């Protein structure tokens, strides 16, 4: 059912005509040649296209894969925008601020205004922002630029009081193949570790999740030292505009006990000392016990030594290769998640999956804590084993390429 | 709604009757398309239909859908694997040198190495279904036990005498003392139920003595009423005190035992009547009430079938005829009426199976009668001799429940055995089991052990599975679910799983 | 609603919910089938038509904020306009109905 | 050929999604639970036929009862001189049709035959009648998923609120060896439940509803010798199990009545 | 390229003249340079894996 055979197809009709009409010709010059040839081309088309609609296999599929996804998972994603609020601008007196006055942040802002405002002799008024595109972006802590101006409004001001609601980013079938194996949730009272992980992974803006469970007492093979029967969840979330639903999703799917960092360990980033405080339960129970921590952020560094290859490969192209593998947009490699073993073999071997033809003489990688200077020239190894407390990230500037 | 043809042979026309060539072409094309685009689709639908999917491709695809590791499954014993062929006697023991083992799976010996390999496709299907549940179902006990029943036994009742497959009792216990007990006694009259509360048998006369003993009623007055007399014949009890009464032709009379009334307030009445071999294979009965509300019955002596019965009111409940050895049977009846005027109970023989108690006869027929009794209930109890008054006996009292001892008011005769049923020391005894042996003098007996259940299984967050050997499930699979990284058993967070 | 007629294979185009729609209904063997286009670009093809369950199954199709279409019963081209109807629901109404579906 | 193959391919483009029907949907729904076939006839036994002598009732006769249901016979049998024999019946439609226990009427009549009559000894074999075709199957899946979406406290609340004559439920979990709302530290990790009622005339039903939600590792034992009154000391005696099971135990309490 | 979804810990390479017995564990290197008139061959049993 996997594959179709077409080498014997021509013989089928070349002898169907022979035993049907008579034993004559079936050559290439006569009229029977074209009839037999077309009865084989059309038969091969059907033989191919009847199988291609079979598989359905979770992999190999496409577009129709959304049904195999929706059999268990509720839905993949959506398409929303990074709408803002609580903005403010530096202006003069009695200025009729324009609608859609575009403000561009340095990291590809292209931000419009949502409603229209008129300023006041005080010199400061509030304006709202909506992103001109539909992907997940962020604004810098300070105002950067103003494009549409009346030469009296001087600069757009970003403050601390403002909000930052995050959007999603469409779909990707090659990315659906990855989260499919994780996002499946179960149909009793929803109290298993896999159920928790799948339910949490479906919350928007949550890039990765880790869940572990004790069963024995004292310590467990996975990282954690404290409570006798704890449940450690280490959510990696860009943001929680529903700061309580990131906890209500935990609470609904959770039965057992909730400690902070297994209860007493060190060097994590718990969200707070006291509890997370769910607002309420609909079962008339004011049970507010939920505890989760965020990973300790890291920095990344990748270096490679490549020959000139076979084609004129620009040195700027190899940089974009590893960023996708860190972001997990490739088909097959999950990405950089908690406890991701940053390796030179998993990285520099996978860069050839999109730009082959080059000879990689050497590659060695290492990393250090985020917001810290670069390591020594000899501080580069082949691997970097990661603990379960945190995960690494890779940016474009950290990659250095030498065409030696 | 409108029909669609989609048939290749529609191209053939009445213009082509004696044409071999073009008809051959069209028919062969139709056969080729049928073979490669309808039969193949049916086969694929069947092999993806998971219940009877035996194709290894289907199981592999469902595994990929579910996502378990596949290294523990023997995918195919088919001819593709190593060391299997038609002759296949090359480079292997063919009896010249060494005897080869015979009790082996088809294929080479080195396939399925390790005890984590399960080689039969049926348990592959079972483990895939249970894995689907585990991945999609996470924690209730009622639902999971129901699922286990459905998957393994195909929705059929079970047997505890082989201790079949249940999830567990959790930290929760089973039971303490013994509750809801019933005592089954084997004797000359077979299975009988006993009750701790006293039983009342309101029949004034256990056996007929003469015509004056039981009056007979004939509305027609077309002949002499049926006569009753005491003869000699073997009783099942061990004496000779049977009764005879004959039905002359042209006489429609029935004999009636004088009974106190009313029997009660419109509840169930357990009529009884010993069945004794007679000239005619049929015996009739009647259970009257406020006129008109009577409900009656007839009993097929020869075969053991209830035949004639009617509803005149809502009286009737049920009827069942009980077998005894050597041409004797047990006949009962039950009645429940909205009213409460239970007046009198009548009896007479009959000629045919569908004969009524009030019909006329064709000749003279005779039949044997002994041991009548009437009580309040739906289940017959032990027989008790009655003479001139009802007699009430209760046979036992639960002298100690927690220790499980019952004491008897009279000393059980030799050859009397006893069963029991209910729940006790954590067990179930849905099937009767011996605990008492009759020697003639004893009055205190001890209950026995049921099939037994590990009642406490104490400890929170502790759970384990228990399986029965009757299912003959492979111990390879038992070793297989003991792992967690494979993840094929439903579980809750913080709870540990043991297959046994 | 959608003004429909009793034809074995038909098409409808209209402006619904501040957007342009184009629905193509055709008979396929036994079941009804539809093809949905919005604003000139395809959305989904060969959707089996059934009663109650919506025609758009996928989130990125039916709405970031748009609506959906629902049949009250199994469609039948000999009954259209006569006891069988098709209804369009805006974002809020369909979100409410979807929550009620569970 | 080309049109037929294209249409046959397009018929089953999406099958795993449970919007499908007609057979593949049977297995798509059999993964959890789903019952099909269920289209039988109400076969009988122990008929009553009062007629003439030494005659035979022809097979596949017609039978009718008071609200006009049509019934066919199965076996042909001879008549004894007494005027009583037993027949076998079968219904016209493959539905669980009800025979009212009232003396039948004749549609198709043979000679010297009359009065198809009822009898108590007859067996009443009640059939299933296409109870789940395609759509109530989907509603069954939806109802199952709804039941399964709720978690422990929520499931308990819904199940207990489901029984008749209940009014309120209060559910708390200790979640530690300490006190959160009330002094339940009898056991380290219990699950306490209180129920109000208009009497609990069905004590067993409440226990069954509570038992239908069970976590499998969390005992229900609660009490501090001072909190709400427990129903019984050692056990609340649930039913054993509807499906191939045995006796389990559950416990729950009730509040203290106060007069304002 | 051939199989994603796999984590590779370490891979090391070595070379030696044709026919030589198996070399010692110390003979493996990250990269091997080869002469112009040299040609490399890999066999099925030559490769050894470890599912650490």
Tab-separated table of C-alpha atoms in Angstrom, chain B residues 42-403:
chain	number	residue	atom	x	y	z
B	42	UNK	CA	-12.361	-2.246	-0.189
B	43	UNK	CA	-9.208	-4.077	0.919
B	44	UNK	CA	-7.589	-0.881	2.198
B	45	UNK	CA	-10.717	0.088	4.126
B	46	UNK	CA	-10.808	-3.383	5.672
B	47	UNK	CA	-7.108	-3.378	6.596
B	48	UNK	CA	-7.389	0.092	8.129
B	49	UNK	CA	-10.568	-1.033	9.878
B	50	UNK	CA	-8.692	-1.642	13.097
B	51	UNK	CA	-10.891	-4.317	14.697
B	52	UNK	CA	-9.943	-7.040	12.193
B	53	UNK	CA	-6.764	-5.409	10.948
B	54	UNK	CA	-4.270	-8.248	10.641
B	55	UNK	CA	-2.198	-6.624	7.906
B	56	UNK	CA	1.102	-5.566	9.518
B	57	UNK	CA	0.913	-2.366	7.461
B	58	UNK	CA	-2.297	-1.366	9.223
B	59	UNK	CA	-0.864	-2.037	12.671
B	60	UNK	CA	2.290	-0.097	11.795
B	61	UNK	CA	0.250	2.863	10.537
B	62	UNK	CA	-1.924	2.886	13.656
B	63	UNK	CA	1.253	2.717	15.754
B	64	UNK	CA	2.586	5.777	13.920
B	65	UNK	CA	-0.728	7.524	14.560
B	66	UNK	CA	-0.489	6.697	18.271
B	67	UNK	CA	3.282	7.127	18.582
B	68	UNK	CA	4.629	4.223	20.623
B	69	UNK	CA	8.061	2.735	19.917
B	70	UNK	CA	7.710	-0.216	17.565
B	71	UNK	CA	10.810	-2.247	18.482
B	72	UNK	CA	8.803	-4.475	20.804
B	73	UNK	CA	6.456	-5.812	18.115
B	74	UNK	CA	7.059	-8.801	15.897
B	75	UNK	CA	5.780	-7.177	12.728
B	76	UNK	CA	5.365	-10.193	10.450
B	77	UNK	CA	6.084	-13.932	10.492
B	78	UNK	CA	5.758	-13.678	6.738
B	79	UNK	CA	8.058	-15.104	4.062
B	80	UNK	CA	10.020	-11.827	3.901
B	81	UNK	CA	11.958	-12.273	7.153
B	82	UNK	CA	15.227	-14.149	7.540
B	83	UNK	CA	15.220	-17.972	7.407
B	84	UNK	CA	11.822	-18.865	5.953
B	85	UNK	CA	11.039	-20.509	2.619
B	86	UNK	CA	9.235	-23.348	0.892
B	87	UNK	CA	12.050	-25.886	1.185
B	88	UNK	CA	14.200	-23.730	3.538
B	89	UNK	CA	16.036	-26.897	4.602
B	90	UNK	CA	19.386	-25.468	3.487
B	91	UNK	CA	21.987	-24.755	6.171
B	92	UNK	CA	19.599	-25.947	8.903
B	93	UNK	CA	18.967	-29.180	10.809
B	94	UNK	CA	17.151	-31.535	8.412
B	95	UNK	CA	17.425	-34.673	10.557
B	96	UNK	CA	20.765	-35.962	9.260
B	97	UNK	CA	22.748	-34.679	12.260
B	98	UNK	CA	20.593	-33.244	15.050
B	99	UNK	CA	16.896	-33.368	16.015
B	100	UNK	CA	15.335	-29.924	15.577
B	101	UNK	CA	12.805	-28.369	17.961
B	102	UNK	CA	9.248	-28.543	16.623
B	103	UNK	CA	7.130	-26.395	18.975
B	104	UNK	CA	8.191	-23.083	17.453
B	105	UNK	CA	6.715	-20.140	15.603
B	106	UNK	CA	6.956	-20.114	11.787
B	107	UNK	CA	10.260	-18.713	10.571
B	108	UNK	CA	13.799	-18.788	11.850
B	109	UNK	CA	14.804	-19.428	15.447
B	110	UNK	CA	16.651	-16.114	15.884
B	111	UNK	CA	13.584	-13.972	15.176
B	112	UNK	CA	11.884	-12.465	18.204
B	113	UNK	CA	14.923	-12.600	20.461
B	114	UNK	CA	14.453	-11.327	23.960
B	115	UNK	CA	11.391	-11.744	26.135
B	116	UNK	CA	10.105	-8.251	25.277
B	117	UNK	CA	9.035	-9.507	21.839
B	118	UNK	CA	5.394	-10.519	21.446
B	119	UNK	CA	4.762	-12.535	18.317
B	120	UNK	CA	0.972	-12.877	17.849
B	121	UNK	CA	-0.941	-10.114	16.091
B	122	UNK	CA	-4.027	-10.381	18.304
B	123	UNK	CA	-2.295	-9.062	21.423
B	124	UNK	CA	-0.672	-6.437	19.187
B	125	UNK	CA	-4.193	-5.246	18.399
B	126	UNK	CA	-5.197	-5.409	22.064
B	127	UNK	CA	-2.144	-3.443	23.218
B	128	UNK	CA	-2.667	-0.844	20.476
B	129	UNK	CA	-6.270	-0.305	21.572
B	130	UNK	CA	-5.253	-0.099	25.233
B	131	UNK	CA	-2.478	2.324	24.268
B	132	UNK	CA	-4.979	4.499	22.412
B	133	UNK	CA	-7.070	4.558	25.571
B	134	UNK	CA	-4.053	5.342	27.767
B	135	UNK	CA	-2.903	8.196	25.500
B	136	UNK	CA	-6.464	9.494	25.250
B	137	UNK	CA	-7.872	8.420	28.625
B	138	UNK	CA	-6.345	9.387	31.935
B	139	UNK	CA	-7.728	8.295	35.258
B	140	UNK	CA	-11.224	7.102	36.222
B	141	UNK	CA	-11.574	3.536	37.476
B	142	UNK	CA	-15.141	2.767	36.361
B	143	UNK	CA	-14.461	3.839	32.779
B	144	UNK	CA	-11.125	2.013	32.550
B	145	UNK	CA	-12.510	-1.230	33.991
B	146	UNK	CA	-15.414	-1.012	31.543
B	147	UNK	CA	-12.886	-0.441	28.742
B	148	UNK	CA	-10.868	-3.483	29.828
B	149	UNK	CA	-14.013	-5.614	29.797
B	150	UNK	CA	-14.974	-4.344	26.337
B	151	UNK	CA	-11.549	-4.841	24.776
B	152	UNK	CA	-10.657	-8.235	26.261
B	153	UNK	CA	-13.903	-10.139	26.752
B	154	UNK	CA	-15.857	-8.478	23.897
B	155	UNK	CA	-18.638	-7.359	26.265
B	156	UNK	CA	-19.422	-10.657	27.992
B	157	UNK	CA	-19.978	-11.508	31.671
B	158	UNK	CA	-16.984	-12.801	33.592
B	159	UNK	CA	-15.969	-15.539	36.030
B	160	UNK	CA	-14.439	-14.849	39.430
B	161	UNK	CA	-13.720	-18.558	40.030
B	162	UNK	CA	-10.777	-18.016	37.664
B	163	UNK	CA	-10.031	-14.552	39.121
B	164	UNK	CA	-10.194	-12.502	35.933
B	165	UNK	CA	-8.683	-9.165	34.979
B	166	UNK	CA	-9.514	-6.033	36.978
B	167	UNK	CA	-7.709	-2.733	37.434
B	168	UNK	CA	-7.653	-2.776	41.244
B	169	UNK	CA	-9.469	-1.790	44.430
B	170	UNK	CA	-7.097	1.162	45.027
B	171	UNK	CA	-6.263	2.032	48.631
B	172	UNK	CA	-10.000	1.570	49.200
B	173	UNK	CA	-11.118	-1.635	50.914
B	174	UNK	CA	-13.706	-4.269	50.069
B	175	UNK	CA	-15.871	-5.106	53.093
B	176	UNK	CA	-15.849	-6.009	56.764
B	177	UNK	CA	-18.386	-8.496	58.128
B	178	UNK	CA	-20.574	-10.771	55.993
B	179	UNK	CA	-23.628	-9.113	54.449
B	180	UNK	CA	-26.646	-10.278	52.446
B	181	UNK	CA	-26.329	-13.986	53.189
B	182	UNK	CA	-28.361	-16.915	51.869
B	183	UNK	CA	-28.080	-20.569	52.877
B	184	UNK	CA	-28.413	-23.298	50.234
B	185	UNK	CA	-29.111	-26.841	51.461
B	186	UNK	CA	-28.717	-29.955	49.311
B	187	UNK	CA	-31.020	-32.841	50.223
B	188	UNK	CA	-33.621	-35.124	48.629
B	189	UNK	CA	-35.404	-32.026	47.290
B	190	UNK	CA	-32.326	-30.324	45.839
B	191	UNK	CA	-31.597	-26.618	46.114
B	192	UNK	CA	-33.642	-24.780	48.763
B	193	UNK	CA	-33.367	-21.240	50.144
B	194	UNK	CA	-33.446	-20.524	53.879
B	195	UNK	CA	-34.443	-17.289	55.598
B	196	UNK	CA	-33.474	-15.946	59.011
B	197	UNK	CA	-36.904	-14.361	59.420
B	198	UNK	CA	-39.549	-17.009	60.199
B	199	UNK	CA	-41.560	-18.498	57.338
B	200	UNK	CA	-45.314	-19.033	57.603
B	201	UNK	CA	-47.027	-21.975	55.877
B	202	UNK	CA	-50.758	-21.332	56.119
B	203	UNK	CA	-51.973	-24.582	54.552
B	204	UNK	CA	-54.196	-26.231	57.155
B	205	UNK	CA	-53.704	-29.748	55.765
B	206	UNK	CA	-50.353	-30.933	54.428
B	207	UNK	CA	-51.924	-34.038	52.879
B	208	UNK	CA	-55.507	-35.013	52.051
B	209	UNK	CA	-57.154	-37.687	54.175
B	210	UNK	CA	-60.708	-38.088	52.836
B	211	UNK	CA	-63.488	-36.257	50.999
B	212	UNK	CA	-64.489	-34.417	54.184
B	213	UNK	CA	-60.875	-33.253	54.501
B	214	UNK	CA	-60.978	-31.098	51.340
B	215	UNK	CA	-64.338	-30.028	49.861
B	216	UNK	CA	-64.901	-30.347	46.117
B	217	UNK	CA	-66.912	-27.885	44.025
B	218	UNK	CA	-68.952	-28.632	40.890
B	219	UNK	CA	-71.029	-25.776	39.395
B	220	UNK	CA	-72.638	-27.871	36.666
B	221	UNK	CA	-73.702	-30.706	39.009
B	222	UNK	CA	-73.541	-32.955	35.936
B	223	UNK	CA	-71.956	-35.805	37.890
B	224	UNK	CA	-70.445	-36.990	41.152
B	225	UNK	CA	-67.643	-34.656	42.307
B	226	UNK	CA	-64.024	-35.768	42.251
B	227	UNK	CA	-63.213	-38.105	45.135
B	228	UNK	CA	-60.082	-37.989	47.295
B	229	UNK	CA	-58.520	-40.953	49.098
B	230	UNK	CA	-55.169	-41.963	50.582
B	231	UNK	CA	-53.260	-44.793	48.881
B	232	UNK	CA	-49.808	-46.346	49.272
B	233	UNK	CA	-46.863	-45.408	47.068
B	234	UNK	CA	-43.216	-44.437	47.512
B	235	UNK	CA	-42.631	-40.920	48.774
B	236	UNK	CA	-39.381	-39.073	47.994
B	237	UNK	CA	-39.025	-38.475	51.752
B	238	UNK	CA	-38.789	-42.140	52.749
B	239	UNK	CA	-42.345	-43.178	53.608
B	240	UNK	CA	-45.541	-44.225	51.793
B	241	UNK	CA	-48.299	-41.655	52.360
B	242	UNK	CA	-49.189	-40.429	48.848
B	243	UNK	CA	-52.680	-39.319	47.803
B	244	UNK	CA	-54.916	-40.222	44.858
B	245	UNK	CA	-57.891	-38.498	43.260
B	246	UNK	CA	-59.595	-39.403	39.997
B	247	UNK	CA	-61.515	-37.349	37.425
B	248	UNK	CA	-64.535	-39.245	36.033
B	249	UNK	CA	-65.903	-38.435	32.604
B	250	UNK	CA	-68.801	-36.003	32.539
B	251	UNK	CA	-67.787	-34.572	35.912
B	252	UNK	CA	-66.171	-31.147	36.289
B	253	UNK	CA	-65.100	-30.987	39.929
B	254	UNK	CA	-62.013	-29.672	41.687
B	255	UNK	CA	-60.754	-30.349	45.211
B	256	UNK	CA	-60.069	-27.414	47.529
B	257	UNK	CA	-57.976	-27.301	50.694
B	258	UNK	CA	-59.597	-25.150	53.413
B	259	UNK	CA	-57.117	-22.344	54.082
B	260	UNK	CA	-57.342	-19.306	56.330
B	261	UNK	CA	-58.054	-15.960	54.713
B	262	UNK	CA	-57.217	-13.405	53.693
B	263	UNK	CA	-53.614	-14.467	53.139
B	264	UNK	CA	-52.263	-10.913	53.150
B	265	UNK	CA	-52.447	-7.437	51.654
B	266	UNK	CA	-52.046	-8.088	47.936
B	267	UNK	CA	-48.431	-9.295	47.890
B	268	UNK	CA	-46.585	-12.225	46.353
B	269	UNK	CA	-47.880	-15.711	47.188
B	270	UNK	CA	-45.569	-18.719	46.807
B	271	UNK	CA	-47.944	-21.534	45.926
B	272	UNK	CA	-46.349	-24.981	45.994
B	273	UNK	CA	-47.402	-28.499	45.027
B	274	UNK	CA	-45.345	-31.683	44.832
B	275	UNK	CA	-45.456	-33.272	41.383
B	276	UNK	CA	-45.997	-37.032	41.479
B	277	UNK	CA	-46.101	-39.364	38.486
B	278	UNK	CA	-49.659	-40.301	37.549
B	279	UNK	CA	-51.774	-41.726	34.731
B	280	UNK	CA	-51.954	-38.411	32.861
B	281	UNK	CA	-48.874	-36.332	32.048
B	282	UNK	CA	-50.657	-33.129	33.092
B	283	UNK	CA	-51.689	-31.615	36.418
B	284	UNK	CA	-53.744	-28.442	36.843
B	285	UNK	CA	-53.928	-25.786	39.566
B	286	UNK	CA	-55.800	-22.605	40.452
B	287	UNK	CA	-55.118	-19.557	42.645
B	288	UNK	CA	-58.344	-17.612	43.080
B	289	UNK	CA	-59.110	-14.052	44.191
B	290	UNK	CA	-62.047	-11.627	44.111
B	291	UNK	CA	-64.428	-12.824	41.415
B	292	UNK	CA	-63.524	-12.315	38.678
B	293	UNK	CA	-59.728	-12.058	39.110
B	294	UNK	CA	-58.428	-15.648	39.147
B	295	UNK	CA	-55.008	-16.709	37.848
B	296	UNK	CA	-54.225	-20.414	37.416
B	297	UNK	CA	-51.639	-22.723	35.871
B	298	UNK	CA	-51.015	-26.192	34.427
B	299	UNK	CA	-47.843	-28.285	34.725
B	300	UNK	CA	-46.545	-30.723	32.093
B	301	UNK	CA	-45.414	-33.640	34.233
B	302	UNK	CA	-43.729	-35.625	31.466
B	303	UNK	CA	-41.551	-32.916	29.894
B	304	UNK	CA	-41.477	-30.148	32.500
B	305	UNK	CA	-43.194	-27.240	30.753
B	306	UNK	CA	-45.655	-24.707	32.094
B	307	UNK	CA	-48.416	-24.695	29.509
B	308	UNK	CA	-51.802	-23.235	30.417
B	309	UNK	CA	-52.039	-19.932	32.286
B	310	UNK	CA	-54.139	-16.800	31.921
B	311	UNK	CA	-54.457	-13.272	33.223
B	312	UNK	CA	-57.908	-12.215	34.373
B	313	UNK	CA	-56.463	-9.520	36.643
B	314	UNK	CA	-52.913	-8.213	37.114
B	315	UNK	CA	-52.334	-11.157	39.456
B	316	UNK	CA	-49.722	-13.262	37.658
B	317	UNK	CA	-45.997	-13.025	38.450
B	318	UNK	CA	-44.164	-16.080	37.057
B	319	UNK	CA	-44.103	-19.873	36.987
B	320	UNK	CA	-41.254	-22.381	36.888
B	321	UNK	CA	-41.257	-26.164	37.222
B	322	UNK	CA	-38.356	-27.780	39.080
B	323	UNK	CA	-36.867	-31.196	38.345
B	324	UNK	CA	-36.396	-33.873	40.982
B	325	UNK	CA	-35.106	-37.393	40.511
B	326	UNK	CA	-37.192	-40.534	39.846
B	327	UNK	CA	-40.293	-39.016	38.280
B	328	UNK	CA	-40.974	-36.337	40.883
B	329	UNK	CA	-41.024	-32.601	40.278
B	330	UNK	CA	-41.528	-29.364	42.207
B	331	UNK	CA	-44.330	-27.054	41.062
B	332	UNK	CA	-44.671	-23.447	42.223
B	333	UNK	CA	-46.625	-20.298	41.413
B	334	UNK	CA	-46.521	-16.612	42.323
B	335	UNK	CA	-49.211	-13.938	42.212
B	336	UNK	CA	-49.230	-10.178	42.877
B	337	UNK	CA	-52.519	-8.288	42.557
B	338	UNK	CA	-53.459	-4.628	42.969
B	339	UNK	CA	-56.338	-5.691	45.220
B	340	UNK	CA	-55.744	-7.813	48.317
B	341	UNK	CA	-58.631	-10.327	48.376
B	342	UNK	CA	-56.844	-13.651	48.103
B	343	UNK	CA	-59.737	-16.020	48.745
B	344	UNK	CA	-58.865	-19.687	48.206
B	345	UNK	CA	-56.602	-22.090	46.328
B	346	UNK	CA	-57.949	-25.032	44.319
B	347	UNK	CA	-56.471	-28.086	42.571
B	348	UNK	CA	-57.572	-30.836	40.164
B	349	UNK	CA	-56.100	-32.897	37.305
B	350	UNK	CA	-56.495	-32.369	33.572
B	351	UNK	CA	-56.464	-34.388	30.355
B	352	UNK	CA	-54.556	-32.135	27.920
B	353	UNK	CA	-51.770	-29.611	28.400
B	354	UNK	CA	-53.947	-26.586	27.602
B	355	UNK	CA	-56.847	-27.944	29.676
B	356	UNK	CA	-58.348	-25.611	32.252
B	357	UNK	CA	-59.314	-26.383	35.826
B	358	UNK	CA	-63.003	-25.952	34.916
B	359	UNK	CA	-63.224	-27.891	31.644
B	360	UNK	CA	-64.894	-31.264	31.280
B	361	UNK	CA	-63.068	-34.550	30.712
B	362	UNK	CA	-63.488	-37.507	28.354
B	363	UNK	CA	-62.653	-40.512	30.573
B	364	UNK	CA	-61.239	-41.403	33.995
B	365	UNK	CA	-57.742	-40.147	34.857
B	366	UNK	CA	-55.806	-40.385	38.126
B	367	UNK	CA	-52.752	-38.619	39.550
B	368	UNK	CA	-50.719	-38.490	42.773
B	369	UNK	CA	-50.497	-35.576	45.218
B	370	UNK	CA	-48.400	-34.866	48.311
B	371	UNK	CA	-46.957	-32.037	50.391
B	372	UNK	CA	-48.708	-28.743	49.632
B	373	UNK	CA	-47.616	-25.402	51.071
B	374	UNK	CA	-48.408	-21.693	50.683
B	375	UNK	CA	-46.356	-18.764	52.010
B	376	UNK	CA	-45.675	-15.031	51.533
B	377	UNK	CA	-42.804	-14.497	49.125
B	378	UNK	CA	-41.442	-15.066	45.643
B	379	UNK	CA	-39.020	-17.938	46.312
B	380	UNK	CA	-39.961	-21.383	47.662
B	381	UNK	CA	-38.540	-22.492	51.004
B	382	UNK	CA	-38.197	-25.758	52.898
B	383	UNK	CA	-41.260	-27.930	53.359
B	384	UNK	CA	-42.879	-28.286	56.770
B	385	UNK	CA	-45.579	-30.699	57.905
B	386	UNK	CA	-48.918	-29.008	58.565
B	387	UNK	CA	-51.876	-30.447	60.455
B	388	UNK	CA	-54.784	-28.390	61.747
B	389	UNK	CA	-52.798	-25.152	61.862
B	390	UNK	CA	-49.998	-23.274	60.094
B	391	UNK	CA	-46.479	-24.025	61.332
B	392	UNK	CA	-43.656	-21.457	61.386
B	393	UNK	CA	-39.937	-22.312	61.552
B	394	UNK	CA	-36.820	-20.187	61.065
B	395	UNK	CA	-33.754	-22.319	60.536
B	396	UNK	CA	-30.776	-20.138	61.480
B	397	UNK	CA	-29.449	-16.957	63.044
B	398	UNK	CA	-26.187	-15.183	62.223
B	399	UNK	CA	-24.631	-15.917	65.606
B	400	UNK	CA	-21.433	-14.026	64.721
B	401	UNK	CA	-21.032	-11.982	61.541
B	402	UNK	CA	-17.432	-10.773	61.806
B	403	UNK	CA	-16.079	-14.236	62.670
